Amino acid sequence: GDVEKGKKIFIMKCSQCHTVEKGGKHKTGPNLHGLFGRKTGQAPGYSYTAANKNKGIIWGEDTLMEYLENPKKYIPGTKMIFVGIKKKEERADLIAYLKKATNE
Numbered sequence: 653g654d655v656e657k658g659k660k661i662f663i664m665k666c667s668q669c670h671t672v673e674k675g676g677k678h679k680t681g682p683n684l685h686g687l688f689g690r691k692t693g694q695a696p697g698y699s700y701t702a703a704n705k706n707k708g709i710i711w712g713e714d715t716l717m718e719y720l721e722n723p724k725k726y727i728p729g730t731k732m733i734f735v736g737i738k739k740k741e742e743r744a745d746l747i748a749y750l751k752k753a754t755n756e
């Protein structure tokens with residue numbers, strides 16, 4: 653899975669909002685380094701809402717997908733703003749990069 657297709661997309665979708673690299677400090681949203689293999693609200697440096705912090709679920713390729721399709725519903729009353737994604741492929745590459753972005 654091409655990460656690029658997920659990088660650019662992650663930009664036009666997640667630009668100067670999220671973070672992956674260590675240098676990417678918490679800004680608008682929480683950083684994603686240990687995404688794969690880490691539950692939600694696992695940021696002791698940035699406490700989230702009571703809706704997301706309650707979203708006790710792992711961020712996998714099976715979940716990320718759904719959420720990517722409709723994260724709003726996935727977490728109502730959240731702070732994250734998004735419309736969603738139609739193409740399932742654009743989401744794959746997105747998770748194909750975020751994985752290599754977080755893992756790193």
Ligand code: HEC
Pocket residue numbers: 661662665666667669670680681682691692693694695700701704707711727730731732733734746750
């Ligand atoms: C800033 C305006 C954001 C944009 C753009 C995106 N995200 Fe985000 N995200 C943001 C916040 C403040 C939070 C916390 C809860 C909330 O929804 O407000 C999140 C959370 C996530 C999570 C959950 C991680 C956790 O620790 O629970 C994921 C998996 C996530 N966001 C992914 C993500 C992607 C891939 C985006 C673009 C496609 C994206 N976010 C946009 C704030 C913002």
